From Swiss-Prot, chains A, E, F, H:
The protein's name in its UniProt record: Polycomb protein PHO
Location relative to the cell: Nucleus
Span covered, complete protein: 145 to 170 of 520
Quaternary structure (record): Component of the Esc/E(z) complex, composed of Esc, E(z), Su(z)12, HDAC1/Rpd3 and Caf1-55. This complex is distinct from the PRC1 complex, which contains many other PcG proteins like Pc, Ph, Psc, Su(z)2. The two complexes however cooperate and interact together during the first 3 hours of development to establish PcG silencing. Component of the chromatin remodeling Ino80 complex. Interacts with Sfmbt to form a pho-repressive complex (PhoRC).
Organism: Drosophila melanogaster (Fruit fly)
Phylogenetic lineage: Eukaryota, Metazoa, Ecdysozoa, Arthropoda, Hexapoda
Known role: Polycomb group (PcG) protein that binds to the 5'-CNGCCATNNNNG-3' sequence found in the regulatory regions of many genes. PcG proteins act by forming multiprotein complexes, which are required to maintain the transcriptionally repressive state of homeotic genes throughout development. PcG proteins are not required to initiate repression, but to maintain it during later stages of development. They probably act via the methylation of histones, rendering chromatin heritably changed in its expressibility. Probably targets the Esc/E(z) complex to DNA.
Swiss-Prot record, chain B:
Disulfide bonds: none
Organism this protein belongs to: Drosophila melanogaster
Domain of life from the UniProt record: Eukaryota
Gene of this entry: Sfmbt
Function comment: Polycomb group (PcG) protein that binds to the Polycomb response elements (PREs) found in the regulatory regions of many genes. PcG proteins act by forming multiprotein complexes, which are required to maintain the transcriptionally repressive state of homeotic genes throughout development. PcG proteins are not required to initiate repression, but to maintain it during later stages of development. They probably act via the methylation of histones, rendering chromatin heritably changed in its expressibility.
Protein name: Polycomb protein Sfmbt
Known partners and oligomeric status: Interacts with pho as a component of the pho-repressive complex (PhoRC).
Segments annotated as MBT repeats: 3-114, 122-220, 228-331, 339-435
Localization, UniProt: Nucleus
Recorded domain comment: MBT repeats have unique discriminatory binding activity for methylated Lys residues in H3 and H4; the MBT repeats bind mono- and dimethylated H3K9Me1, H3K9Me2, H4K20Me1 and H4K20Me2 but fail to interact with these residues if they are unmodified or trimethylated.
Taxon lineage: Eukaryota, Metazoa, Ecdysozoa, Arthropoda, Hexapoda
Curated annotation (Swiss-Prot), chain D:
Record comment regarding domains: MBT repeats have unique discriminatory binding activity for methylated Lys residues in H3 and H4; the MBT repeats bind mono- and dimethylated H3K9Me1, H3K9Me2, H4K20Me1 and H4K20Me2 but fail to interact with these residues if they are unmodified or trimethylated.
Quaternary assembly: Interacts with pho as a component of the pho-repressive complex (PhoRC).
Protein name: Polycomb protein Sfmbt
Full-protein interval shown: 534 to 977 of 1220
Function field: Polycomb group (PcG) protein that binds to the Polycomb response elements (PREs) found in the regulatory regions of many genes. PcG proteins act by forming multiprotein complexes, which are required to maintain the transcriptionally repressive state of homeotic genes throughout development. PcG proteins are not required to initiate repression, but to maintain it during later stages of development. They probably act via the methylation of histones, rendering chromatin heritably changed in its expressibility.
MBT repeats: 3-114, 122-220, 228-331, 339-435
Subcellular location: Nucleus
Organism of origin: Drosophila melanogaster (Fruit fly)
Length: 30, 440, 438, 437, 30, 30, 439, 30
């Protein structure tokens, strides 16, 4: 129905460095 | 040694046709998932092996970069954290280790700052959050989609009918023995010769095509017997690209459009730099017809007749060159001075095929004069070479090979299967011929 | 034998959930290319063998028909040329010989009028042009797309980790030995025993899953050693409603905590939603919970793994808010159960609302709709079923002919529910409603 | 009084054509933003006046409900918190006080529980969060869009040319004097007489149409002189719906498709229940042509000729009725069990218009036999009536008026501007004719 | 660019019977 | 570009009662 | 009429890079711009022919020919008449001002196409040539310029009253009336004075009637209006006329927030100097996300007359460290130097806390602006002026816009969705003067 | 339904010259 795949979506990802690890909220096309 | 586009990419105002100009190109249908300004994880070429690498896994260390430019499949990258452009670098988007942000962490890999800037912070968290929050990156399925679009419809060992390069008036049975970037190497039976051909090319046909259409056919005896009287290795109709359907024709394929003796213009299949007046020599079935280029020397054998389908984008009504400011190749016996279509028609007592017999739609293909691309040499299709759009005439292109004379130019449709974006050769592992070096 | 839907199809106002209600069902993504009123070429069952057939080609003669109705994969066909509906017939859209108009002529096949009406015209051209001009038909690639959507992501011989039906607190190595409509039969490594489940089921996992997540694993010695091959079922074959990007590299979470209480569908009884307790938080969102209605057991053999984003777990109060009779904890009454009293009795806390993230799509399922549903307690079986209740995105599925005690709670995107006609499509037997004895 | 659909809605298996079946119907383009299962704030009819209403604002108190069914413009509502369906109620979706969830709070209004269930909770926060979280509601601009779609392209006082109902072979100057749901009342210039028709009807035309096309025109002398200079009250071309453009024709409007003498079939403009053999009497410009229904008694005056455009969905090739099992109306002097097109063309020595002159595309309009809807009586366009889809023939509908004989059934195209969804009359404030006693 | 796949297309098809063969113009989505 | 209107969107809304006020996250099609 | 800058010499150079119309969401034609394309054919004014066409009185006196669009730069298009062998007669036009039509427009109006003088000799009947050139070619949709016209109209009309930031005292809004509209830029005349200023209809500094009272912002207005407010008209500018990147549904009914708190520090574009991003302090938290901030570079002022309202979702506020992270020279707080300033030291000196990163929600769209792109830009300090400008920097969704011919001291930090930037050719389209580079 | 507006359409137009009038088939996006 109306609720389906969208043109773009936010995405939560992570980044690890030698000092630790954290999250970042980004976005990508479908 | 394959030619690297790098010296061209390094010039300001380098003009490359974008991947989206090429419908058949890998990645075309998902290319809008990319954009200048997006962030990616990419190889750090400026660090030590301080990252403990799991054996078997990639020894590469990564950092984050922004895409500044996209030229064909090439992308200009700029590492996050640099104050200048001095370390910006070009990559092959679909060959280099380039990933969505987050790819490394999921694999337990830390991001490692380039040595040039490594001491800027102790903990790069605040910087990276600042630069990357709300920013665009790659969709996680991007390279799965790319990989899907790399696959040919054909497999090794398939038998098909293809135009005999040694006698273009017939097709000959051939088998697929190698595939590179959907370009098929076809080996003719009853010889050891063959040639390269993209899977979408109009000169290859399914098993049974010649017999159905009424085209001349050369093949082993067993095959000829089957044709007059489906095997596992038959290349069937659904593998072949057509700009029409057979539903559009009656079951017997009888047409009533082009008529034997009609004149028109056509790209010379034996000299692609030439568009020349041509004559319909024989009307086959399902829209196919044998034509003869009128600039050729006289020949009653018809070994040089060539088949074009009536919906081919490489045939044109008489006057096409004149209307579009193209220097037509005059018929045998005429000059660029002495030739006019009206005079020619009077001399031969012939009739030109009406405009209504031709059906051309002009897409917004996006090709512009001056754009760089990669192009196969139709006379030696082993080769794919550095090329430039020399002319745009509606949907028709004139393609020039950089460093060669104009004698080697090729008139090709904008949707030709023989043209590719900058970077295609690297993507599919094909050798790219660069411009020849000038001797003096 | 297998149940035929026809007695239901033949009734007025039969309400079948359309194929588009089932994301995992074959043809779902191309189903909108079908429509009532469209024309197709279809098998003529009412003709003599007058058509000369070529060797290798279908021996079937064709005529043209209009699609009058569509119920799941079922379609009501009406041959062109008849004066009444007395010869209208139901077909399985993705099993019967059905084609776009024009298909036969391209293959040199004539259309043959049914014997019943054959003398109406000498030349049927004028009639057919009149009926078919401007009419909708199938796209030429329709059934190619259908056929593509039939294939499982799995193949015979793949090894995977799946929940031990004899001890659900552990997964056990198993092999795909049979596939029916993307439902896999998984034979345990150490036995002749096994079970059926859809390829999208949350209780099957790739090689290495248990070790990575921290779940109990029963497996051959050498396999255990390898964890701590060409037949390995790998990660990309499995469906997840999340990505691992969403979690830290080590899978450490700080959402659900041991001791927290919530509600969950009983894995051992799908008819039941019960208060439950977090017993062990694993990695990457996976956690072991225990159904509070079970008899006392300190072994932990009955613990069950739900991922934190499972649509089958709910915050405390879910049943009460939605007028669902909760299955009470052991030693409690159903009708008078309250979370306030229960939390006081146990000194425990409920998992907060923010720990759950339920979104309710317009799934299109409505009360009274017919469908086919796997018996979760005996997954060999797929049965005639009806949507008894819609609770947000959660469905209560009733098995026709059985009492409400056998109803199952299933998410609207469950891989265990299928359109009317699915069993015929994939060659699975359909269990009909048991006959009433008296 | 106006007929209320209520008893029909209250029956099981009531089949109404959805709003999306009607391209011209208000709300059609945004209708997919609605769905069964969605949540809305709606009038609480079961509470005391305990809410403190600010002067100048609605005195209504609201609660939340789930939409259970949608039948045309009608929606079945169920208040959140009720365990049975005993208090479920139908509403006119585009007339009643209905809003997205959140509308009340932004205006400082509290939701008030119905008295029947008020005892269930002291604080309803936990219940409402449990029920509404992640659930679908209305886009905030939904009813703004509905409102926009209610407006006619016409205003009062506009002058146009429309078919003379007293003499359908000519058009006649007329003025829009009333508008009800985009149905215009057009009062003739030299009379008190007039008629109703939808703004999308093919029988109304802009100023200058008849002179441009070559159609007969009845108008004051000053008007014709002007046609052989735009007035403010002129209804102009862009106000009128056409299924073609003038770019498709040459500048002079000369056509070479239909020719005088050609025969075909057509819906009788004087009897919509009838499809009859017809003859092209005069070919005009830009695709327009005068035809006569052959069932009419002989009349050499040509006062009963009627203009159909060549792309009209109400003309068909000869044999349409035969091919589609429709009882054709015989030409004057023939019988419905003897008449054949081959015999007719023999007797009159005439030629049927070719198939290539007709172009019918059959959309997936979604109309199905048995569907309820509201339909104008074209013979008395004052009336909109309870109706049912009796037959679907390609894109052509046979529409039956519930309770009446089949003699009054109307043949109407699926995109006719004279058919409307269930509840349209209520939305539009038009009277709905129910079935007779 | 703008010139791409459309939601529905007309399609010219043929029908053969024992009496002869003719063309019909129809349509299909996707 | 890619960042444009989507077919559906989550929407944060509020509900006031006589006992207080709170937020609810819902959705609607655009 | 006065002297307005013509882009022509810039357009005539190779590699002129103009931001396309689609980079500007508020620009007329943005939503239908993808109906245009290089290579398409149009009917256009023939400037090279004698008046041999019999013109019907009242209709356009212009005679037409067909041309191909070769380039599109903002609203500008390079035309080439069909039938010319070289580019010698190629010409630039204003796409939305010139007499440009879909092919076929003339014939429908009984007008013949007249070949230009220079090539008229090539054919007697141009039928075959034109069929050859135009068959299967792209042209304009017939409704194109109707859609353009629709997109030209402001949401506002003359005479509407609204509340707008007082340019003489930015800590208050003052009642103003719309007395003039040019390209959706409104001229607002304050009541109780004869003064006013220009600003675009989408600007964040204009607000509906009742806004200040509802939000808790300082308000100056005639006594009658003040009296109407404290209790709680045909010419009221109401909420639906104003652009917001949020809804009031997202806030509690009373608008009470708990995000930014008085005393928190952050960075912000200086409303009085757009070339400056500076540390700022939350001075007062209002309702519904609005808050008063003080630019810390200002001289000491206890009156608070220079406080400025930013909404919490404004793209022109940033967390502390934004400049440092993005290589932007931060304007130091009063009493500090660019070298001797760090946020760590400043926070210790003042004993203050920085607003957390989670209070800022920034999404970076693929806006398409690139460094070196030309555009037209309003001078926020003198909004009468719209000037020749260049994108100097792209920092996520934030742009640094440079005025060609001026020093960098006049640069403006503007969001990519700023309503104060416009495509090349906009001034001609809407009849606004374009300021060119100074002498 | 499946039959709605399409992204581009062919369009028949006309051209008049001093020598006569003719038609051309072109296209435009919608």
């Amino acid at each position: 129905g109306a609720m389906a795949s969208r043109r773009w979506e936010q995405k939560l990802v992570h980044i690890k460095t030698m000092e630790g690890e954290f999250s970042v909220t980004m976005w990508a096309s479908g | 040694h394959s030619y690297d586009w790098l010296p061209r990419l390094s010039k300001e105002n380098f003009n490359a046709a974008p991947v989206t100009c090429f419908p058949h190109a890998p990645g075309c249908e998902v290319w809008d998932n990319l954009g200048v300004g997006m962030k990616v994880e990419v190889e750090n070429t400026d660090c030590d092996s301080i990252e403990v690498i799991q054996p078997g896994q990639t020894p590469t260390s990564f950092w984050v970069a922004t895409i500044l430019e996209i030229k064909g499949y090439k992308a200009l990258m700029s590492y996050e954290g640099f104050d200048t452009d001095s370390h910006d670098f070009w990559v092959n988007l679909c060959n280099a280790e380039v990933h969505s942000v987050g790819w490394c962490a999921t694999r337990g890999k830390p991001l490692i700052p380039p040595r040039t800037i490594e001491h800027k912070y102790k903990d790069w968290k605040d910087f990276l959050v600042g630069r990357l929050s709300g920013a665009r990156t790659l969709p996680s399925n991007f390279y799965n989609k790319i990989n899907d679009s790399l696959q040919s419809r054909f497999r090794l060992g398939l038998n098909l009918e293809c135009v005999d390069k040694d006698r273009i008036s017939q097709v000959r049975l051939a088998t697929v023995t190698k595939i590179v970037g959907k370009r098929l190497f076809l080996r003719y039976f009853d010889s050891d010769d063959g040639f390269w051909c993209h899977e979408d090319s109009p000169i290859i046909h399914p098993v049974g095509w010649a017999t159905t259409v009424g085209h001349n056919l050369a093949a082993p005896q067993d095959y000829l017997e089957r044709m007059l009287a489906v095997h596992e290795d038959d290349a069937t109709i659904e593998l072949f690209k057509m700009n029409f359907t057979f539903d559009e024709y009656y079951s017997d394929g009888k047409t009533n459009s082009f008529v034997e003796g009609m004149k028109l213009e056509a790209v010379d299949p034996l000299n692609l730099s030439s568009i020349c007046p041509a004559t319909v020599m024989a009307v086959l079935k399902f829209g196919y017809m044998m034509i003869r280029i009128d600039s050729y020397q006289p020949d009653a054998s018809g070994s040089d007749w060539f088949c074009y389908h009536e919906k081919s984008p490489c045939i044109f009504p008489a006057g096409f060159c004149s209307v579009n400011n193209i220097s037509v190749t005059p018929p045998n016996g005429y000059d660029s001075r002495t030739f006019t279509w009206e005079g020619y028609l009077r001399d031969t007592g012939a009739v030109a095929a009406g405009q209504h017999l031709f059906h051309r739609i002009i897409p917004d293909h996006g090709f512009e004069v001056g754009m760089s691309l990669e192009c196969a040499d139709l006379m030696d299709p082993r080769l794919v070479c550095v090329a430039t759009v020399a002319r745009v005439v509606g949907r028709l292109l004139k393609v020039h090979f950089d460093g060669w004379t104009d004698e080697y130019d090729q008139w090709l449709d904008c949707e030709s299967a023989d043209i590719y974006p900058v970077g295609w050769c690297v993507l599919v592992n094909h050798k790219l011929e660069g411009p020849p070096r000038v001797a003096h």
